[PDB]
Write an enzyme that holds these catalytic residues in place. Structure first.
Site, mmCIF file in Angstrom:
data_model
loop_
_atom_site.group_PDB
_atom_site.id
_atom_site.type_symbol
_atom_site.label_atom_id
_atom_site.label_comp_id
_atom_site.label_asym_id
_atom_site.label_seq_id
_atom_site.Cartn_x
_atom_site.Cartn_y
_atom_site.Cartn_z
ATOM 1 N N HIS A 180 0.813 -1.212 0.000
ATOM 2 C CA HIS A 180 0.000 0.000 0.000
ATOM 3 C C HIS A 180 0.856 1.277 0.000
ATOM 4 C CE1 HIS A 180 0.004 -0.352 4.540
ATOM 5 N NE2 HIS A 180 0.012 0.982 4.479
ATOM 6 N N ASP A 220 1.341 -7.769 2.439
ATOM 7 C CA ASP A 220 1.514 -6.350 2.192
ATOM 8 C C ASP A 220 2.966 -5.907 2.114
ATOM 9 O OD1 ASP A 220 0.967 -3.597 1.907
ATOM 10 O OD2 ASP A 220 -0.435 -3.505 3.568
ATOM 11 N N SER A 232 3.491 2.262 8.772
ATOM 12 C CA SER A 232 3.360 1.308 7.657
ATOM 13 C C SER A 232 4.728 1.109 6.986
ATOM 14 C CB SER A 232 2.417 1.857 6.591
ATOM 15 O OG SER A 232 1.069 1.772 7.023
#
Ligand code: U0M
Ligand code: U0M
Ligand code: CL
Ligand code: CL
Ligand code: CL
Lengths: 695, 697
Positions: free
Chosen positions: B64, B206, B632
């Site tokens: 992402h 991810d 993240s």
């Protein structure tokens, strides 16, 4: 794994002892004496119940006593909402059309029934499964005046293992069973439909009744002179609780299983029964939900119809998940391949021939069964105006004496029952357009109910126009349209009525399909008698329990949770904290009883809380149960009551065909929670005092 | 409770970290005067965190985080977003425009220096102590005259911490040639898609792979075909040892914001205004949107992204409100401030109690205004698409009132109309959303506080919201393409000045800016009181068990690999597996499609050295580390500092952790590095990436 006959207790006893059972065999089931079996009852023809006092007190589920609690509820005393607690025996409410059945004696009559059957002559006769034929054999064995010589007692012979074993049951039926206690619906039905088939579960699903009888304890219909029954056996209540891995056992009346399905029958159940029910109910429910969410009045009118459709929809999703992921088809294929190999080795081809007859019958009825489920799910239960009024022969042969008004009065009564306070013609038209669109895509023109051919022939394929026309021109399309018909009734108007023609036409096709499909049942039944005979001759009875048939069975296992999916674990026990986590005062399903909330806040758990001070609500076990086991007593290793079975998780519904050790659980209300509710919520101390509670 | 510690605090935390399982030496993790594991961490593309995993500048971050770069290189002929991307040679790695990676070269405590400079006070209420412009002048003064020219690639920045009680100067090294090297297909990289956002258990792989390029001397340089891969100061070794329950885990990254020093009144304001309004208004908007998307397949295509964008902060607000309701956040802030007030009374210093009182008074004073602000922002600014319809500029209106500048004004307005009424805009869906949103808004905001045009609902339309909305589209120049073209043929300022949609949009934006301007002055008194409040908290209980609020600076956090119980009788373990991906497979739902190559790896059990001791293939794990937005892509380290995973999310039950850490509920959701390497190896077949990493047994 199994739902065992009482006769099989002897052969299971050592396995049960290694699993933790401590009570003596004959204290649980004694074929010639009083035993725990004598405290179990078939409650009101479906459910199971249990006697818990020397004064005939009976425990069962709240959903089992629901109709009786509802029949005694009024606006002045709403027992369904607030609960009911008779503070004296004289305040216990009688119930019309109720019964409790005790299983007094059970006998193996296999040789007797097989000798009698040798006088049939026609080899493919179905008398071996006929209740009428078996009742004549039962009456012959019991005597010419059995029920007169032994009042309250009746006999019944049932077939087991596809007609390879017969048992005679001597039953004692009591019809004066009074309502004693019930928690409010917020406890008895806490999860409501949202938590149906769900574990973890926080529902206090119980209700209390009392069996009454004449002065000698003999069955008698309701009378103000009836006295509480003193039974020969009742359950002691345990307050020791449960821990993970504890032995648990159940006795009850499981209704149906399909443990001997061929692989072709599993494929048929998935691809026809389940897929059509899922597809058609999702269409119906989707339109219903849209309409209920858009209009508060539609939500009130359709909530119960929506919830009734969802119950078997969820069961079919659960069952199809097992077929897809637990190898049900493959395991049945292996079962039948093993028998076929064994029969080839012994030189007996009848077992392979029997599996082949079942496969050939299943393949032959495929199109018909598909058409049957499509019309049943799509129209018979899918569309409300399919059950609109159809004029009877005596009504039309009266409209065309002055008993024309009597016929109109009867038709008006049926019209008012169809178009009742909960019926919306607009919602029904929307549901019908979606359901008929799917139905017409799946059923070819030559197989349609005659009236539905008008969609292509008269309405240019426009389903909406065809449905609009049914309501626009029908005498049952509106109150004004009915009243105009009732003022000037003519048989000609009824004979050409689009709604009457639709309803008649769809019911004609439904009955024609049913009549054409009925003959396929018997060849499968006959082949299953040979199939199960071979399976039992080959491997015996140890893993192969007989299919459930609403007869008394026992099952044993342990208190154990399970993992529903990767990295998720559901433990064996829920608590009162879990009820409080779920509280939502603006959702009727999750409202918490104010007295119960206060008990939780003040930790007023008495002797009912577990060793850590937490209040248990429910637990789950590896027992094998099905519909009919609701209300069943759950026993300790010592045979003391530790809970009542009330549900089973959706992941285990495929357990009616193949038991699922890692997913299937019985959902049980903890007896400590039952007593906490009777005590702190109902304040009905006399019920606690009459039970025999062991420390 | 548990925190996001400054690198300077590693010394004072080290013994607690060692007793929790840390085995590496302190200076191997962080050393101010040398090379440490800190040197392998980067701020990836201004938001995310990344980490260097090879001596040739290979960088790992989330999928992402690299999503926009993978999407910018995707075409119908080579759809990298859908099928993944695997450069089989360094020359095949794709450059990215507007990308950056920032290294934290040095960090220095400049508190004494900044506090001395601040003493030259012209106004005691000056906000210069928090001004980026003022602190940049102080950093430039300390660094030197033309520091960027003497040290190309390097830059200096001073940030305030602890409400203005601590200052750190960061020397940053920025690289802008960062090329796309590898990415799994979107079916792996965003496996749960929006359904599994904020969810644990999680089965999403991810990750995405980049490479930092530089000039011949390893110095930063913009994209050039002559650029060569960077040989870095330090890189992470990859562990294949895996994780077990209770194992020590630590993270370094750039958490953006926290509110650990909120007063109890600020927690109440956050719940009763910010969160309740966002929840109420987004549920209305989403409910209308979902009903329209379910009824029309074309509406589902047009509104799916707008629906998903609204849901993300809606879910966050639900999790935050659940923590306020059940985890005692308000009570714990009340206890924190009561303890300081009691201590200040004993010290003879009333300034701490006075500071808490100023915050409470400011919060109570702005209540009505803040409520009106969130109501218009959630209800109209975000809630109604025609609020962002075209508004003629002052120069556009002048051009329409004797030159060829008329056609230029109409071309500009047409461009904005075509951007508003784009391929994904439905006037019918927007009218339905507006009627529901305005109905709620009009019930909550009294007539005297309405944007002027909304007063027409009561005055002109007899309270009929539907008629008012119908009229806006029926009579507006932006109500349809035909209505715009008729205006464009005969444009007049008079028509635009009386246009109902222009008046609506202008009126709602006027009220929104007026509320914002009236609310802005309340921020400064709270900020000044927080400087005194946090100073007291620190003087009383120490800069030891209370961490500084996140501010997009490098922080470390430590904890253990551990699951949790979300509710009664339910336990989520610490680790997910590839079997969990297979349980979730649904080929008719784009969110849960499983890559055919990955499904075959699972079936063949072709897990190599990546599977756990039992033969199961791990996918993700969760830990008691304290993370937030900005974390993240963060490296997750072992007790030995070896890379064991990448942080990519946090469970919704722990979102209240920005105010109060939740030991029994809050977890960082991390992609297992064994799963990353399994995907690079068995799905991407990109062996050269495995060969350049230093994989430890
Ligand atoms: C409410 C809920 N509706 N669906 C739920 C999950 N499962 C799906 C399969 C079968 C069931 F009984 C329930 S919870
Ligand atoms: C799809 C979904 N799956 N779970 C859901 C529930 N929770 C509610 C609180 C916050 C979240 F992030 C998600 S929505
Ligand atoms: Cl009895
Ligand atoms: Cl002071
Ligand atoms: Cl917590």
């Amino acid at each position: 794994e199994g739902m065992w006959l009482m006769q099989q207790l002897g052969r299971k006893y050592a396995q049960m002892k290694e699993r933790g059972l401590k009570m003596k065999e004959y204290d649980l089931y004694n074929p010639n004496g009083t035993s725990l079996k004598d405290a179990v009852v078939l409650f009101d023809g479906g459910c199971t119940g249990e006697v818990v006092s020397d004064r005939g007190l009976v425990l069962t589920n709240h959903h089992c006593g629901y109709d009786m609690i509802q029949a005694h509820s009024t606006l002045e005393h709403n027992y369904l909402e607030n609960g009911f607690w008779a503070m004296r025996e004289a305040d216990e409410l009688p119930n019309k059309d109720i019964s409790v059945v005790f299983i007094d004696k059970i006998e193996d009559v296999t040789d007797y029934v097989k000798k009698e059957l040798k006088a049939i002559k026609d080899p493919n006769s179905m008398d071996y499964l006929s209740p009428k034929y078996l009742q004549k054999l039962a009456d012959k064995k019991a005597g010419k005046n059995f029920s007169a010589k032994n009042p309250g007692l009746s006999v019944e012979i049932k077939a087991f293992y596809g007609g390879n074993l017969y048992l005679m049951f001597t039953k004692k039926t009591y019809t004066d069973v009074r309502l004693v206690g019930a928690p409010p619906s917020s406890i008895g039905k806490f999860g409501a439909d949202t938590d149906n088939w769900i574990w973890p579960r926080h529902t206090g699903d119980f209700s209390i009744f009392r069996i009454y009888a004449d002065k000698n304890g003999n069955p008698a219909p309701y009378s103000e002179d009836n006295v509480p029954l003193k039974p020969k056996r009742f359950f002691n209540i345990s307050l020791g609780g449960v821990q993970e891995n504890d032995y648990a056992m159940i006795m009850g009346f499981p209704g149906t299983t399909h443990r001997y399905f061929t692989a072709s029958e599993v494929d048929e159940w998935k691809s026809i029964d389940n897929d059509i029910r899922i597809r058609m109910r999702d269409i119906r429910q989707g339109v219903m939900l849209r309409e209920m969410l858009a209009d508060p009045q539609i939500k009130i009118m359709y909530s119960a119809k929506y919830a009734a459709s969802q119950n078997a929809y969820k069961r079919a999703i659960g069952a199809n998940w097992a077929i897809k992921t637990r190898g049900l088809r493959q395991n049945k294929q292996a079962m039948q391949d093993r028998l076929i190999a064994w029969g080839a080795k012994q030189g007996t081809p009848r077992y392979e021939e029997a599996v082949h007859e079942i496969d050939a019958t299943v393949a032959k009825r495929a199109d018909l069964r598909r058409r049957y489920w499509m019309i049943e799910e799509g129209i018979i239960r899918g569309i409300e105006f399919a059950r609109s009024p159809i004029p009877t022969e005596d009504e039309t042969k009266a409209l065309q004496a002055s008993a024309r008004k009597e016929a109109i009065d009867k038709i008006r009564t049926r019209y008012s029952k169809f178009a009742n306070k909960d019926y919306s013609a607009e919602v029904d038209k929307k549901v019908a357009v979606a359901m008929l669109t799917e139905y017409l895509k799946e059923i070819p023109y030559e197989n349609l109910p005659l009236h539905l051919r008008l969609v292509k022939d008269r309405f240019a394929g426009d389903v909406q126009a065809y449905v609009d026309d049914i309501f626009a021109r029908s005498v049952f399309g509106s109150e004004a349209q009915f009243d105009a018909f009732a003022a000037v009734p003519s048989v000609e108007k009824l004979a050409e009525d689009p709604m009457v023609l639709f309803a008649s036409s769809v019911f004609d096709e439904y009955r024609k399909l049913y009549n054409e499909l009925r003959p396929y049942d018997d060849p499968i039944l006959r082949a299953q008698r040979t199939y199960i005979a071979g399976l039992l001759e080959m491997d015996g009875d140890q893993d192969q329990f007989p299919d459930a048939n609403l007869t008394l069975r026992f099952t044993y296992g342990q208190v154990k949770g399970y993992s529903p999916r990767d990295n998720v674990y559901y433990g064996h026990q829920t608590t009162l904290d879990g009820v409080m986590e779920k509280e939502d005062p603006d959702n009727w399903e999750f409202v918490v009883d104010p007295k119960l909330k206060a008990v939780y806040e003040r930790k007023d758990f008495g002797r009912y809380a577990d060793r850590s001070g937490r209040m248990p609500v429910a637990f789950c076990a590896t027992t094998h149960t099905t519909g009919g086991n609701s209300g069943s007593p759950v026993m300790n290793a010592n045979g003391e009551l530790i809970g009542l079975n009330f549900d089973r998780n959706w992941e285990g519904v495929g357990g009616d065909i193949q038991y699922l050790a890692d997913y299937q659980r019985s959902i049980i209300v903890d007896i400590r929670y039952v007593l906490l509710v009777i005590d702190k919520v109902g304040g009905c101390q006399r019920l606690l005092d009459e039970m025999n509670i062991v420390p």
